[PDB]
Chain A
Amino acid sequence: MVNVLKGVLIECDPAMKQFLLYLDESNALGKKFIIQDIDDTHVFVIAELVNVLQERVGELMD
């Protein structure tokens, strides 16, 4: 089962903020690169480099 490995960052956001990150992913310019996938409602596989952006954008956004 050690078939495949992928370095990624695991984000453990709340059931409120996650969807926002989704929204950040789409309807965005130079984006949609951001989320690898939604593993759980709470957790997402995302970014790497994008994490700095996702966090900052969330901050700036309401």
Chain B
Amino acid sequence: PGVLDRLYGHPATCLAVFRELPSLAKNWVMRMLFLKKEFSKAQEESTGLLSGLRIWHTQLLNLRIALLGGGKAWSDDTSQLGPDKHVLHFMVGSPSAAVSQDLAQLLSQAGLMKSTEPGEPPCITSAGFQFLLLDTPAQLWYFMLQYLQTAQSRGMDLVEILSFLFQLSFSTLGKDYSVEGMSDSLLNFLQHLREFGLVFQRTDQIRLWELERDRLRFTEGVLYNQFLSQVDFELLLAHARELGVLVFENSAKRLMVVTPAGHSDVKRFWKRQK
């Protein structure tokens, strides 16, 4: 028994040390998970704490029954912690943690219904800017939240959940872009939504890579420069295009040179100052 605190302590130490900047915690948190845990954990620094928080519910999957109930008891504490904490990394952590608590089925639907966290997942879900990585955890949270409700008879949350409907515009975008990953996430939301509440609701190809290549063919959109007053002004204006990497061509005997459109403006500015 005495050994238990010591061994697991060392990994608690390691996680503590490289807690701040990256994502070291995930592997170590898992080990930590097995061996009032939540109450004690709360004091420790947030990141990593959340990581431990995330994996522990997952890890549960007799005494086990006792464990779940015990976890249910301090679901609020983690929930209070989840908000308030609320980068992409952090954001991923908060929803991943929330998602995990949700599958556990410890969270109270009421309470969840009126909370900032649910607004935040659809908010990121709405915005085009969010990256694929944030998207997948946001999506997963939503899926899990709906999964949590196996009733909807008594689940205020399955109202706010409706917030998925807002997502369609986002799916239109995303579709416009070739973002398959984002679209798939949307479909999962839809499918899961329907699932919960469904009851309530009513060679040959050689020429095809050649036909692809027929759609690519080169030229560049471009400014030409001529009638330069003396050689020093070709060479300055030329060297200042070459360091900008937007020389398409040059001929010093012509006193003539070519810049593609994207560095017309840095050349127009250098031509005015010096």
Contact, chains A and B (beta carbon distance below 8 A): yes
What A residues does B237 contact at CB under 8 A?
A: 1-2
What A residues does B218 contact at CB under 8 A?
A: 11-12
Chain B proximity mask over A24-62: 1 for CB below 8 Å, otherwise 0: 000000000000100110010110000100010001000
Which one, A2, A39, A46, A55, contacts B228 given CB within 8 A?
A2
Using a Cβ–Cβ cut-off of 8 Å, how many residues does chain A contribute to the interface with B? 21
Number of inter-chain CB pairs below 8 Å: 75
Query: Across the interface, do B224 and A8 meet the contact criterion of CB distance under 8 Å?
Result: yes
Nearest-neighbour CB distance to chain A for B19, whole angstroms, equals 54
B13 within 8 A of A: no
* Interface of chain A residues 4 through 33 with chain B (CB within 8 A): 4-12
B34 within 8 A of A: no
Query: Across the interface, do B256 and A39 meet the contact criterion of CB distance under 8 Å?
Result: yes
Size category of the B interface is 20 to 34
B249 within 8 A of A: yes
Nearest-neighbour CB distance to chain B for A58, whole angstroms, equals 9
Query: Known contacts A9-B220, A10-B258, A55-B217; is A2 also within 8 Å of B225 by CB?
Result: yes
What residues of chain A have their CB less than 8 Å away from a CB belonging to chain B? 1-12, 36, 39-40, 43, 45-46, 51, 55, 59
What residues of chain B have their CB less than 8 Å away from a CB belonging to chain A? 214, 217-234, 236-237, 248-249, 251, 254-256, 258, 260-261, 271
